[PDB]
Write a protein that binds this ligand. Sequence first.
Ligand code: HEB
Length: 123
Amino acid sequence: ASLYEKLGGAAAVDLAVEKFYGKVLADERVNRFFVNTDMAKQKQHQKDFMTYAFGGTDRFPGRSMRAAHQDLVENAGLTDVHFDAIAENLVLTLQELNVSQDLIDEVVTIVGSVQHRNDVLNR
Ligand code: HEB
């Protein structure tokens, strides 16, 4: 049930991620947050993020997730419209790989979790 088991190829991950990353770069809006973090650790984010999309609940007992994201709401004025932004980009990513909509619809559900979202706003 590992990521590799889903794609069945390592490189597939390099490109899959590279595609998203390249897109996240164009959006200088969300980049405002990646100002403190370096470009090195940044990529790692798009990796663990693009993973949780496929329901990679391997290990995510929150707790730290909140605090980690909390440091943001402290300095950066994070909001909801922000989550919908990065979330959309992902949708356009799967559209480039020529993937049916029905399949892309389920993906939205996974990330459409109310909890994960509530964690961002920290409440
Ligand atoms: C929603 C799918 C989502 C998840 C699951 C997620 C997960 C992480 C994890 C595991 C880290 C690493 C924490 C650590 O290693 O200590 C992480 C770091 C950061 N994240 Fe996110 N994140 C999710 C969603 C978002 C959204 C939306 C963000 C805002 C654009 C966002 C930001 C960040 C940032 C800035 C970091 C780096 C924190 C740091 O330690 O420097 N994440 N995220």
